[PDB]
Design a protein around this ligand. Structure first.
Ligand SMILES: Nc1nc2c(ncn2[C@@H]2O[C@H](COP(=O)(O)OP(=O)(O)O)[C@@H](O)[C@H]2O)c(=O)[nH]1
Ligand SMILES: CC1(C)CCCc2sc(N)c(C#N)c21
Ligand SMILES: [Mg+2]
Length: 169
């Protein structure tokens, strides 16, 4: 069966770890270590195909060494996460996209924009502005809540579909 290498990126505290644990283990984790970077495997069924997901949950200070660049190049798809109550994390999206485009040496990288913490009453990033941004990038936009599990499967599943469309080219 096919293996899909997914990388979860985004600013500090947007919910990278919460979304990953939620997908892999079907439970919400409130206090996951903000500095631990790790990978997780899960056999899933997307559409009709049984496939294995290998998800790298990124953390820690950014490092632009040849090694870390070669390591990120390995990723087939990128989950670009911001929190809908953090404007700065939404503006940090550009920079993640540019680093992904650079290491992949392509303008066509499977990618999904994720607006996390949709359950929160505080919202500083409107849905239409994030939708407009993903439209200029030509990528899907999925709103999520790692707390309520809203859109979690949709976010990772859409990314796999994005890798599938890329491979068949
Ligand atoms: N209300 C709410 N809090 C969330 C959500 N996802 C994560 N959090 C909280 O946001 C904080 C940072 O989340 P975390 O997974 O560590 O993010 P990371 O630094 O991006 O890996 C923690 O207090 C989480 O419990 C969500 O969807 N809703
Ligand atoms: C994790 C992230 C910031 C996002 C994905 C593209 C690249 S390439 C590189 N050396 C990185 C680091 N550190 C990254
Ligand atoms: Mg984390």
């Amino acid at each position: 069966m096919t293996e899909y290498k997914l990388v979860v990126v985004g600013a500090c505290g947007v919910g990278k770890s919460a979304l990953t644990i939620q997908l892999i283990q079907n439970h919400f984790v409130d206090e996951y270590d903000p500095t631990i970077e790790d990978s997780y495997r899960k056999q899933v069924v997307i559409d009709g195909e049984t496939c294995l997901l290998d998800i790298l949950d990124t953390a820690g200070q950014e490092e632009y060494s040849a090694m870390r660049d070669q390591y990120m190049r390995t990723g087939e798809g990128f989950l670009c996460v911001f929190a809908i109550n953090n404007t700065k994390s939404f503006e940090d999206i550009h920079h993640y996209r540019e680093q992904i485009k650079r290491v992949k040496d392509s303008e066509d990288v499977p990618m999904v924009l994720v607006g996390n913490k949709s359950d929160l009453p505080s919202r500083t990033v409107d849905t239409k502005q994030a939708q407009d941004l993903a439209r200029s990038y030509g990528i899907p936009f999925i709103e999520t809540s790692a707390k309520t599990r809203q859109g979690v499967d949709d976010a990772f599943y859409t990314l796999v579909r994005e890798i599938r469309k890329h491979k068949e080219k």
